[PDB]
Amino acid sequence: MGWYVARRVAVMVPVFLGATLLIYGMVFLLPGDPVAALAGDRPLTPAVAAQLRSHYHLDDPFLVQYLRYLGGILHGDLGRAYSGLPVSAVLAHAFPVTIRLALIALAVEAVLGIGFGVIAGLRQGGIFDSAVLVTGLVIIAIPIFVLGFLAQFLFGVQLEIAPVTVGERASVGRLLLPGIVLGAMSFAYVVRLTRSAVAANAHADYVRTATAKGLSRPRVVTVHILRNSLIPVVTFLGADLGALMGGAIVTEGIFNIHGVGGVLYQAVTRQETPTVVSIVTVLVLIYLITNLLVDLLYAALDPRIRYG
Amino acid sequence: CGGGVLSPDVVLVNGGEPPNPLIPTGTNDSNGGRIIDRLFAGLMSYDAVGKPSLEVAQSIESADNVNYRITVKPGWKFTDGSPVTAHSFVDAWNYGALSTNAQLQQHFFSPIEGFDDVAGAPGDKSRTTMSGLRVVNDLEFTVRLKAPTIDFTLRLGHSSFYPLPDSAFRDMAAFGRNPIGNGPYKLADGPAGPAWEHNVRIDLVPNPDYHGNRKPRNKGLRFEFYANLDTAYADLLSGNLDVLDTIPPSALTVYQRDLGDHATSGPAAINQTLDTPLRLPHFGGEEGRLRRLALSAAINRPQICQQIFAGTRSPARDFTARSLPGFDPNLPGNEVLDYDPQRARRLWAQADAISPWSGRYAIAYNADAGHRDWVDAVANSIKNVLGIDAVAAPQPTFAGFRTQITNRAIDSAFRAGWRGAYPSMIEFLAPLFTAGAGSNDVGYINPEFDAALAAAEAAPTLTESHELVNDAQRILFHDMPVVPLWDYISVVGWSSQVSNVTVTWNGLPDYENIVKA
Amino acid sequence: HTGFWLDAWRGLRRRPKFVIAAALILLILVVAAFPSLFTAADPTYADPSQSMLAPSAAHWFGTDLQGHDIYSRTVYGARASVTVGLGATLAVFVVGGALGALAGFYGSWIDAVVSRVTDVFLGLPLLLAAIVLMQVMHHRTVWTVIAILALFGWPQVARIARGAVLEVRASDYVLAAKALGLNRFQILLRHALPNAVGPVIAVATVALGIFIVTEATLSYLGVGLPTSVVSWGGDINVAQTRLRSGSPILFYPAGALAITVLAFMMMGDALRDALDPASRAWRA
Amino acid sequence: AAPLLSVEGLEVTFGTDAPAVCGVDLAVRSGQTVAVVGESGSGKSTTAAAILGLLPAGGRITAGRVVFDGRDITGADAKRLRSIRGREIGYVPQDPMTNLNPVWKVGFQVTEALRANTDGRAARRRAVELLAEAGLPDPAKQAGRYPHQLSGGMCQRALIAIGLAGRPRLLIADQPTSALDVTVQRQVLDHLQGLTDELGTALLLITHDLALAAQRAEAVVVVRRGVVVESGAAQSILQSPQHEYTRRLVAAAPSLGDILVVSELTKIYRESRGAPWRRVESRAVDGVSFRLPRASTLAIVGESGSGKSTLARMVLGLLQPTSGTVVFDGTYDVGALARDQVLAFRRRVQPVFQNPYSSLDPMYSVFRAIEEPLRVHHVGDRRQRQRAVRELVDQVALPSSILGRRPRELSGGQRQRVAIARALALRPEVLVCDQAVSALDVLVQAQILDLLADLQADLGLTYLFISHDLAVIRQIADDVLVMRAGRVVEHASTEEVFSRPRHEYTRQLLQAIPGAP
Ligand SMILES: Nc1ncnc2c1ncn2[C@@H]1O[C@H](COP(=O)(O)OP(=O)(O)OP(=O)(O)O)[C@@H](O)[C@H]1O
Numbered sequence A: 001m002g003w004y005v006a007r008r009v010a011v012m013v014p015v016f017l018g019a020t021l022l023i024y025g026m027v028f029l030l031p032g033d034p035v036a037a038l039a040g041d042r043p044l045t046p047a048v049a050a051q052l053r054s055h056y057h058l059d060d061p062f063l064v065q066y067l068r069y070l071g072g073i074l075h076g077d078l079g080r081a082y083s084g085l086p087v088s089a090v091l092a093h094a095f096p097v098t099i100r101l102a103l104i105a106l107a108v109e110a111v112l113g114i115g116f117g118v119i120a121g122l123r124q125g126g127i128f129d130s131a132v133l134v135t136g137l138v139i140i141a142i143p144i145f146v147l148g149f150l151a152q153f154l155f156g157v158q159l160e161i162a163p164v165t166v167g168e169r170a171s172v173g174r175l176l177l178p179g180i181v182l183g184a185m186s187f188a189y190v191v192r193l194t195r196s197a198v199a200a201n202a203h204a205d206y207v208r209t210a211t212a213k214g215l216s217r218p219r220v221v222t223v224h225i226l227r228n229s230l231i232p233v234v235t236f237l238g239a240d241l242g243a244l245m246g247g248a249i250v251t252e253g254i255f256n257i258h259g260v261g262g263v264l265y266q267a268v269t270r271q272e273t274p275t276v277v278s279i280v281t282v283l284v285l286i287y288l289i290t291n292l293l294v295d296l297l298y299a300a301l302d303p304r305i306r307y308g
Numbered sequence B: 001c002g003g004g005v006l007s008p009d010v011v012l013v014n015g016g017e018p019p020n021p022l023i024p025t026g027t028n029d030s031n032g033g034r035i036i037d038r039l040f041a042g043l044m045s046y047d048a049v050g051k052p053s054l055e056v057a058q059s060i061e062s063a064d065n066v067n068y069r070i071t072v073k074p075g076w077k078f079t080d081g082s083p084v085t086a087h088s089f090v091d092a093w094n095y096g097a098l099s100t101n102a103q104l105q106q107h108f109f110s111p112i113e114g115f116d117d118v119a120g121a122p123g124d125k126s127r128t129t130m131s132g133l134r135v136v137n138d139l140e141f142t143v144r145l146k147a148p149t150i151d152f153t154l155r156l157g158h159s160s161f162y163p164l165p166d167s168a169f170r171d172m173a174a175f176g177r178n179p180i181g182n183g184p185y186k187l188a189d190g191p192a193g194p195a196w197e198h199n200v201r202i203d204l205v206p207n208p209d210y211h212g213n214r215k216p217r218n219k220g221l222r223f224e225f226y227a228n229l230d231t232a233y234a235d236l237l238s239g240n241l242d243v244l245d246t247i248p249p250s251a252l253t254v255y256q257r258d259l260g261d262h263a264t265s266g267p268a269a270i271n272q273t274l275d276t277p278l279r280l281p282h283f284g285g286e287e288g289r290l291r292r293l294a295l296s297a298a299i300n301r302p303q304i305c306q307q308i309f310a311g312t313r314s315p316a317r318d319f320t321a322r323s324l325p326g327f328d329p330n331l332p333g334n335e336v337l338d339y340d341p342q343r344a345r346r347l348w349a350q351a352d353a354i355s356p357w358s359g360r361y362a363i364a365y366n367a368d369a370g371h372r373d374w375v376d377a378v379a380n381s382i383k384n385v386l387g388i389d390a391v392a393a394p395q396p397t398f399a400g401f402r403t404q405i406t407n408r409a410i411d412s413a414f415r416a417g418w419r420g421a422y423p424s425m426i427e428f429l430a431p432l433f434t435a436g437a438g439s440n441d442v443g444y445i446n447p448e449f450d451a452a453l454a455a456a457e458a459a460p461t462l463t464e465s466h467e468l469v470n471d472a473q474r475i476l477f478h479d480m481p482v483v484p485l486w487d488y489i490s491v492v493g494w495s496s497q498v499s500n501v502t503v504t505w506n507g508l509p510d511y512e513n514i515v516k517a
Numbered sequence C: 001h002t003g004f005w006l007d008a009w010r011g012l013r014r015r016p017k018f019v020i021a022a023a024l025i026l027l028i029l030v031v032a033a034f035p036s037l038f039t040a041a042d043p044t045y046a047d048p049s050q051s052m053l054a055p056s057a058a059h060w061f062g063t064d065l066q067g068h069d070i071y072s073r074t075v076y077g078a079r080a081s082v083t084v085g086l087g088a089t090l091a092v093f094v095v096g097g098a099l100g101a102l103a104g105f106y107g108s109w110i111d112a113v114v115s116r117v118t119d120v121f122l123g124l125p126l127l128l129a130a131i132v133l134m135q136v137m138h139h140r141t142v143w144t145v146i147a148i149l150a151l152f153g154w155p156q157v158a159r160i161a162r163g164a165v166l167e168v169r170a171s172d173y174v175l176a177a178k179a180l181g182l183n184r185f186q187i188l189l190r191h192a193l194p195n196a197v198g199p200v201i202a203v204a205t206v207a208l209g210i211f212i213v214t215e216a217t218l219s220y221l222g223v224g225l226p227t228s229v230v231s232w233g234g235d236i237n238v239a240q241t242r243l244r245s246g247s248p249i250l251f252y253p254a255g256a257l258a259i260t261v262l263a264f265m266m267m268g269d270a271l272r273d274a275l276d277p278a279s280r281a282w283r284a
Numbered sequence D: 001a002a003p004l005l006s007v008e009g010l011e012v013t014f015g016t017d018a019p020a021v022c023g024v025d026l027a028v029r030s031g032q033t034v035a036v037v038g039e040s041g042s043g044k045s046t047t048a049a050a051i052l053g054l055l056p057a058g059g060r061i062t063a064g065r066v067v068f069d070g071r072d073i074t075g076a077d078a079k080r081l082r083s084i085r086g087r088e089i090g091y092v093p094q095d096p097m098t099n100l101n102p103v104w105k106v107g108f109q110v111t112e113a114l115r116a117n118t119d120g121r122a123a124r125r126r127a128v129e130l131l132a133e134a135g136l137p138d139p140a141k142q143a144g145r146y147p148h149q150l151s152g153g154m155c156q157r158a159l160i161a162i163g164l165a166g167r168p169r170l171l172i173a174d175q176p177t178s179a180l181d182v183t184v185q186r187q188v189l190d191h192l193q194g195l196t197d198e199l200g201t202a203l204l205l206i207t208h209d210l211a212l213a214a215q216r217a218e219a220v221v222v223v224r225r226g227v228v229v230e231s232g233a234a235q236s237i238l239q240s241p242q243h244e245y246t247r248r249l250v251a252a253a254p255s256l257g258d259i260l261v262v263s264e265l266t267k268i269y270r271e272s273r274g275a276p277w278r279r280v281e282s283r284a285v286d287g288v289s290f291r292l293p294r295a296s297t298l299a300i301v302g303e304s305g306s307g308k309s310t311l312a313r314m315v316l317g318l319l320q321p322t323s324g325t326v327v328f329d330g331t332y333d334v335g336a337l338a339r340d341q342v343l344a345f346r347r348r349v350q351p352v353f354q355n356p357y358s359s360l361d362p363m364y365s366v367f368r369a370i371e372e373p374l375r376v377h378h379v380g381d382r383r384q385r386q387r388a389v390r391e392l393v394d395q396v397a398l399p400s401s402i403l404g405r406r407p408r409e410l411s412g413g414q415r416q417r418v419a420i421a422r423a424l425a426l427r428p429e430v431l432v433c434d435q436a437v438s439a440l441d442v443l444v445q446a447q448i449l450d451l452l453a454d455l456q457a458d459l460g461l462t463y464l465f466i467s468h469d470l471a472v473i474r475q476i477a478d479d480v481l482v483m484r485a486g487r488v489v490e491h492a493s494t495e496e497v498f499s500r501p502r503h504e505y506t507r508q509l510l511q512a513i514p515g516a517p
């Protein structure tokens, strides 16, 4: 445990250094002069061709500019947006609504997936099991933005029962539909994985020798099945949340939601790279930290790998 | 909990790249005029309705409506600390009205009692000051016109009669990109390399050297240069803009549903009409007047206005536009232009007794800004209803489309809309329906009608002149050199924070008093 | 009686899921290979006369704004998407399988560095990394998209192959073989390629659909393929404005996009359930 | 009267395949011990699990009855069997590794086996009492260890403690000591037999060998293919077998120059057990030295974890020794094998590995695997390979229609026969049996031992046979070498091992065989 986390952390610092170096390399190494690509769309003038030189220090070796860039990122200075404002302020004012959307997405995902998965796994071979499997399969196929278009169309234009545009009025009643749209993709993975896990776990030997000693149905079921089957679910849940943070962009764009996903959508469709690379770096660090946390939690739940 | 799309604190409105140096008399387009109105202040100022009020001039008197004797208030200054004096106005007007300077808005200065001497021909242009503008003392001067013009006192607020600072009449080149103005606003000047950003944006801040009618009630504007207005509309929807000032045509059917009373509407001062020159065959004489009257009476204007524009247009009741200060909707005799195929067929029957028919009737039109819909619609509505075969005929270039009419009314009857300059119906009538007043692209000749206009301008009071121009307009119904179609109606959408927008008289919202909290 | 490559075919020959997926995949492959067979019209012909025509015998899939009937426009896009996916999947399979094998089989001082590398490349979500990298390119063609995709697609296949080979290495036939010759490389080939080539095939035939979806959603934003190549997700971008007005033009290209990915996913599902059922309980 | 558990006529089938347990019967006299015995796949566990309703997915009862004090529990009724399981009939599993939830702190899995309690005060200490009477070294300290931390010898004690929770009136221990090792099996069973009579429990135990079942239990019930063959007392059955099957079964019960000279062989493991600066070594094997005459059989016998498998590798060169000499035949040194010597040496020594299920490269045809050693050295062109294979497949029984098959479609003994044939492909001079006959039923065990004896008598090889017990050595080997703690404990001929042992370990190892004299 204590000597395990000492290894789980030390195996991570190189990951962080490598990822950040790769980011700061693909830009500032490949496209010859980086000022050619850092301009985006607006014309290049010596009036702007000098402010980014002082902010990025493109005159000295790769190492010093890299470390200076890291220092600026850590100290809470990410550049200046297209609208003359510092990016940090925009992020600080945009975290609430995206956090609120991710919360409902993850909630519906977890609860519906786990519920339907255990209900299917405890009674296999059933018509219900077949139906949930084929439904998860067909849902897996559709891309996120295609499903988002279908949803917004069918439920906002044909019959007006949900707002087709969530403009800055972020009541949860209006955020419900985008949350479901965002979370269904992961919910399919979850139900499939947990159904397989439970159906393969409800036959092991320790369950047999436990039910042999007169334990009540609910007690043996809950403990001896929904511990050993729920572990991998939370592992994959951490992983796929890390994967979905990036899928949130288009579902945040096609609904005009004034969050960080919408900010990034604007920045990429209008091609302002200096305000994109920073946001992506921050998101990657957040992903890495959450992976650290979920790995620690995993090891805390299963003692077998928790040996040292 | 919380949220927000936190935005800068000035204003983000739309606009474009003014394709001309920012000189008052050097621009003649709405895309480059909406910026120069905020940087200066003339002898008068129009409110949202279109009523004038003294701003810089101190006392204006006219004993005849000919010899105007104007006094300017002393306590003013430009944004470089230069005093505004009558010499500033005199030099501005003389420099604008001179042919060798070759400016755009020159024809404004026609009624200044000597304009021909300096704008006719280099025979006597040696004296380059019109014989009307004197100077009594540095705070007053004299103006003199050719004929009694009761309306001249109104147009003084136009962006052409604006003064220019004393240090600008020798360096018109750099002044053409960094102007200096007394207006309520003043170019932006923060981080070096600001102001005109060039095909990007323009920054404006309030001017602390202004006391007039138009004190700004917000922190400044930032005109965002755009194109493909649907882009700006999406940007607005994404919380990245404050005033759209135009709803793109692709979305004017759901803007209310998806914007929820953050969108207003208001009549403008822009009409649009198509015309057939009196030249091409089967269109002259009495039979030609009957041809035009029938073509007028065989158009389903309300149907088009409802179907295609879906309420951003409105059928015309007379040659002028909706909010013209003194416009009478139901002018007696309005029935001549309406949609009655009975009248249309009976009139074609009474008409083709001189000429049965020739052949095609095509419509030339610029085809890039987007006219196909209503062009084809009106073509179908005129064809197959009277037993004729009219069709469209696009020209992709606006340059060629304009050269065709500078070719002196050759062929292929075409469309032309006429924007307005200042709130007066006389400005909709005189420049287009006059023996030789420049743009008369059908060559309408009626000295009786021109005398009617002359007598109308020759009036002691203003309501009487209204009535006179109304009766003169009724006189036109007997000829209808051109056929009106409709006037413009704009729709403006503010986003979430600015709260006091109003469409004034031409579509442009009141940029001066839009409060952002 | 015969190699496992022959009895598995019979065991799968009677699978409705598999036969359906195979039929759909064959149809997609033939339409992507030979587009000009179905009709003869040209997709880049732009007639501004017809702009919002309805489905009919003349133009099946109506018409778009500038006049391009959606029918012919919805074929070469399939060609582009399918070639992207196939090339990326082949490359990623080769590289990931090779590296995972060489890592899992040898052990010290090699599997360590390989794990470090795949862990570094694992911290980057595919979509975000691709977005960031596609901002600095001016020569945007199909090949560069395949390259950037394969650059980040491998870590998963690498992990799978490493796990599989590390497991197979713990048998006794692999030991008895080296007990009589077969230096560490020929034995590796002959005995560890076949008995473990399954899981990599499964993860590859799923990552195929993954890459197709990623390419589509990336070309949708406008930082993907250029406008010169007709393609889904880019025929959708110009159709998102007219959707809010109540005209379902957008759903025809999306209808074709949501079918190839399905045909690949539900085929990878059958292959996985047939060749490696064990790892379903704690993976995927 | 009223003997417990009269189970006349169980007829379970598994998913419409076939009757897997045909008509059987037995009756426990409520105070006696009955041990049923049968070869693998005979249907002993199945009928032991079909009593408690613990049948796997496919199973189902089709006829017969199982009364308990007179009430049919055939009608599973999972509302009533709760009134029996744990209170009247216990259970003991077979696999001590995978029969404890591995994430639940076995001290806690036990604390609920007595679920009839107050749930919060008496449990945590009555459970320690139970483990104390179970016999573990220190119940208090081991009651807080996860099941993945304990050895095999304690897992079975914990399972027995769980079984004896509500002091059941009948126990169905199912092959308990099947995965345990000798000198632990005997002590566990001695503890069990003492723990039994104190309550009167019947202890229906399943096992698979005669000599043990007779010395332990009172009645025997032999079963073949799920059919009761016979029944009676232990002495009368073992001494007087009537049916041919039990006669064969008892007759197959095991109860009654120099080429290689290692020297001071030793090997250490630089183990890492946590803190990187805290690395402790684990000495595997050391101080070994002996001699092996030709045409003989010297065997190594040791307990689980005595360091015999590592010694076998280090003899086969597949493991780099730390110190010591393994010179072979006087020419081939094992320490530093020269370049040509690797392939000059691999063709005189060959191994035979432990289990038949995982040493055959499952994707290989039984011919393609046998030919592989004949191929790697490039001997036999294309068809003389078929010649050598057809001669080899007859040296072992292996009916010659077995060619072209796959390992997945073979039985147990045939796998070991194929392995031995392959090892015999290239004329080896010494074989090394790595616990070859360890996973097999008694009949194929004795059969392949006879086969090996014949092959030695026909080829002049020298076996290094390796085992984990001592019962299977007396009629084959001639030298013995006991190992424990990585060291040597005794080396002498078999007669001095069976008559006059010389070390207290050798004694309690001999007297631990199912002999019990
Ligand atoms: N779920 C099942 N499906 C099909 N057949 C089964 C199933 N469970 C058990 N069987 C059959 O029942 C038999 C089990 O009998 P038996 O008790 O001898 O097995 P075992 O416990 O492995 O043998 P041993 O006790 O010698 O180890 C097997 O031969 C197997 O073929």
Ligand SMILES: Nc1ncnc2c1ncn2[C@@H]1O[C@H](COP(=O)(O)OP(=O)(O)OP(=O)(O)O)[C@@H](O)[C@H]1O
Residues within 6 Å of the ligand: D269, D271, D282, D284, D303, D304, D305, D306, D307, D308, D309, D310, D311, D468
């Ligand atoms: N990788 C290793 N690291 C540390 N010690 C090891 C390692 N492998 C083996 N050992 C030590 O040597 C012993 C031999 O290994 P193992 O237990 O697998 O086989 P064995 O005891 O020789 O054979 P058997 O399975 O017949 O008892 C282990 O019990 C352990 O004490």
